[PDB]
UniProtKB/Swiss-Prot annotation, chain A:
It comes from the Viruses. This is Spike protein S2'. Subunit of the fusion protein that is processed upon entry into the host cell. Mediates fusion of the virion and cellular membranes by functioning as a class I viral fusion protein. Contains a viral fusion peptide that is unmasked after S2 cleavage. This cleavage can occur at the cell membrane by host TMPRSS2 or during endocytosis by host CSTL. In either case, this triggers an extensive and irreversible conformational change that leads to fusion of the viral envelope with the cellular cytoplasmic membrane, releasing viral genomic RNA into the host cell cytoplasm.
Amino acid sequence: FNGLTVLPPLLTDEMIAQYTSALLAGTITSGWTFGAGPALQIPFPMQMAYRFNGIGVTQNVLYENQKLIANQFNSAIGKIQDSLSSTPSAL
Amino acid sequence: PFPMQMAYRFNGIGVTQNVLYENQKLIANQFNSAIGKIQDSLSSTPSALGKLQDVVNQNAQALNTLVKQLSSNFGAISSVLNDILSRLDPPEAEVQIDRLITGRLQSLQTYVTQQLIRAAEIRASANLAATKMSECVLGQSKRVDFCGKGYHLMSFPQSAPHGVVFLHVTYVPAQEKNFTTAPAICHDGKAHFPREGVFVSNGTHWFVTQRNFYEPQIITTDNTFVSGNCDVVIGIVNNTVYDPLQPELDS
Amino acid sequence: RLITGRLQSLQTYVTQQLIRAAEIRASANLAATKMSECVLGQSKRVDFC
Amino acid sequence: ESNKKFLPFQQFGRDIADTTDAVRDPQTLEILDITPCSFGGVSVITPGTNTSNQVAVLYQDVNCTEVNVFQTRAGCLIGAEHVNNSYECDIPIGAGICASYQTQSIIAYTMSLGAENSVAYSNNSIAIPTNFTISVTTEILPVSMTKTSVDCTMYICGDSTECSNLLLQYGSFCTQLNRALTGIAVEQDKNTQEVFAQVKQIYKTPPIKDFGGFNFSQILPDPSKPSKRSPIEDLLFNKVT
Amino acid sequence: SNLLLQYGSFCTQLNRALTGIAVEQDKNTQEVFAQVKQIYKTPPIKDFG
Ligand SMILES: *[C@@H]1O[C@H](CO)[C@@H](O[C@@H]2O[C@H](CO)[C@@H](O)[C@H](O)[C@H]2NC(C)=O)[C@H](O)[C@H]1NC(C)=O
Ligand SMILES: *[C@@H]1O[C@H](CO)[C@@H](O[C@@H]2O[C@H](CO)[C@@H](O)[C@H](O)[C@H]2NC(C)=O)[C@H](O)[C@H]1NC(C)=O
Ligand SMILES: *[C@@H]1O[C@H](CO)[C@@H](O[C@@H]2O[C@H](CO)[C@@H](O)[C@H](O)[C@H]2NC(C)=O)[C@H](O)[C@H]1NC(C)=O
Ligand SMILES: *[C@@H]1O[C@H](CO)[C@@H](O[C@@H]2O[C@H](CO)[C@@H](O)[C@H](O)[C@H]2NC(C)=O)[C@H](O)[C@H]1NC(C)=O
Ligand SMILES: *[C@@H]1O[C@H](CO)[C@@H](O[C@@H]2O[C@H](CO)[C@@H](O)[C@H](O)[C@H]2NC(C)=O)[C@H](O)[C@H]1NC(C)=O
Ligand SMILES: *[C@@H]1O[C@H](CO)[C@@H](O)[C@H](O)[C@H]1NC(C)=O
Ligand SMILES: *[C@@H]1O[C@H](CO)[C@@H](O)[C@H](O)[C@H]1NC(C)=O
Ligand SMILES: *[C@@H]1O[C@H](CO)[C@@H](O)[C@H](O)[C@H]1NC(C)=O
């Protein structure tokens, strides 16, 4: 109040969340294609197998262990959720 | 040869070189048209060189403000040093000269500090430019959106006043068509997976094509490999897998 | 005297804020790079993501 | 009038920043809160003067009652008409509000983040490109500054010996100022060398430009002109001043 | 204010620097988050395998 004022950010938190949601939807529904040009749809297990192929693991490894991989992914996301809810010094 | 080099680039981004060799005239025309349109884009829009113009403007403004700071009294009787020297005796004008010295020294220190901060910013930009030169001009980078938006093929450096201009040549898919895909197909109780592509169906038949270009091929034992049986893969479908050795044995 | 003191304090604050803003700009450039190279594509750079 | 609960002995309150926030009337036990008179910055929103001379004024951090009249989270906006539509941000006002000149008068609206899209996702459908395009884009990166040197002997003192003698009493401020400036000047040349001098030898293109149909005439140096720069380079050096 | 006017253009420099920092903040946020061209939406049926 001594000539010290704060200007609001141009993009509101809702707009930042909208960008983040758009990025999530693009990644889930089209993989890395949308960042290079037009978005091309692809089933999520298939692009997951593409990622496995990109790290040096054959596609059959993912297809024959699909349920285990999905369970591990869900458990890891839940554990991150819990860790964020528990530890206040992470941020 | 340059067409062979560009075919190597196509292999790098994931497209077979025959796509280039069978579209050499079209690719050359597209490259020439894009290079021609770069001139129009640069000439029509003067806000692209705004980075270099803003650097020049900031330095000029800093120097001009430094010069204009010499006309300020800083609490002294007058800004002119000769005026204060002649008007008053040294033993009394010493305090005014000290006030002017303090003000001018503070202004010089402020200018120097701003110059160091701006120079650090410019050094960060120059390090980025050197990395871009090494990774996009002297190579072909797989880092996304580092050497242009798309799939990087090559880039060309161009000198600019106190700067550098990169013309990032990239591969952009254009016309997409939806298909029906299956993770695997099993022929004789053995699941087959695509060796380097994806299984697609135009409605009646099943082909295997490369992922970044619709170039369908008959599913054989040379573009698929066998792993497991029909009962593990979720979404497996039925199809015949061609065996090129069988007609040779029959004939 | 008050003007000199307050001007010096304001200049110090502005200079340190410029340094802090430079650091935050570096962090934001890193974050933009991480978005481009790990949300929009799969990265082979080790420990980058 | 304030409801701050002063103790019977306390006379004037204060905030967390040690500022007089309340006072007690010397002739009445009433408690009066002190609030600064409303102030703020004044921002003027305008298109180019070549387009129109009409402007909009943004009063920052103040409600419109303390000053066609639109109240934004960034302050009170006067002269701009709020519009239910949404376009790309032309003139950034703040808090998701932008302004532009459209059919004509200045308008205020919430910025549009982009074009809505929904990739037709199913569990057995894939989209594959049947064609392609070759896209060439432009990236500009500053590489260096102008090397500037400043001498205290002539800047601080205009060829005056007494001033130089008095300045000599301040130690080595100016020596380290010159040292910093020289460091910057050398740093700039290091920047340029790091960027461009990345090649061991000077390679030359063949006299016959037969590259399979690819044409690099716009980027290869132009021999006809006295300056051996490409046409694109000539445009770049002409535009930048 | 009259005595402060005798110190030159310190206010202009300080306000310009602060405004540059303020604009740089929005530039940072736009660089990080506005990388996407269109607003993609996930399908209502969440069948991701
Ligand atoms: C590979 O590791 C996974 C753990 O991530 C194993 O899956 C677990 O198997 C045990 C049986 O001993 C079950 O109790 C758990 O519920 C399973 N976890 C999940 C997430 O499915 C899996 O068996 C291991 N496979 C091999 C071949 O070692
Ligand atoms: C899917 O592609 C196959 C190509 O193998 C098409 O089969 C051919 O279709 C043409 C009609 O344009 C016929 O003249 C050929 O004799 C067919 N050949 C074979 C081996 O079947 C098929 O028609 C396509 N299906 C759809 C729905 O487009
Ligand atoms: C692919 O072909 C196999 C064999 O023709 C199919 O297996 C049949 O599955 C049904 C459903 O359980 C059984 O009643 C038949 O006895 C199976 N046939 C044999 C020879 O064992 C299989 O179903 C086909 N794939 C799909 C997706 O239907
Ligand atoms: C892929 O796109 C290119 C455009 O870049 C197509 O080439 C055009 O074809 C039309 C034919 O209707 C011509 O009139 C244009 O002059 C061509 N453009 C260029 C730059 O040569 C090409 O036909 C497309 N590929 C397919 C298989 O349709
Ligand atoms: C490479 O492109 C340039 C265009 O930039 C071509 O120069 C053109 O040549 C035609 C025919 O000679 C003229 O009509 C144009 O006026 C020229 N344009 C310019 C800007 O000079 C050049 O011929 C091309 N190279 C080759 C080998 O064809
Ligand atoms: C795809 O979904 C349909 C219904 O939503 C289901 O019948 C089919 O089995 C699914 N296939 C795969 C591979 O998930
Ligand atoms: C002071 O005098 C005024 C008028 O003479 C009166 O209204 C007020 O109540 C007095 N206050 C005290 C504390 O005596
Ligand atoms: C309107 O003005 C009042 C003060 O009169 C202020 O307290 C309030 O915050 C203003 N409204 C908004 C939305 O800022």
